């Protein structure tokens, strides 16, 4: 137990996000089967896996953090970068003892590490009009 590690998953996602594009197999099982694939660290992901149904049966929910940022097209923006954000959107509603403003300052993280460069500070403002959505808590 290292305070070094939160946990790749979450993160980690976005990248079986990108194999729903291309691969577009079951989804919340693909996803997450990434994690276990490769053997990633060794972790246990199973309960994770039931994560991405939610965006299966709930992906419109998660639009509507992206709603007022949508960039003329999702499918158009970073791959990655924008699965990257999607599941950040969720974040928000499963914040497991985090703010919404703070799930902010990993965006730029999992869209200039997770994605690609240049167009990182822009990942960050898209959590910020995205994040007060699923919390309309306003700190």
Sequence with gaps: MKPAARRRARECAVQALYSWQLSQNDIADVEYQFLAEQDVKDVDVLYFRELLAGVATNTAYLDGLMKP?????????????????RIA???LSKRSDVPYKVAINEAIELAKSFGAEDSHKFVNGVLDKAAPVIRPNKK
């Design 69 to 85: 940022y949508l960039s003329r097209l999702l499918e158009e923006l970073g791959q990655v970068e924008k699965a990257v954000l």
């Design 89 to 91: 959107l969720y974040e």
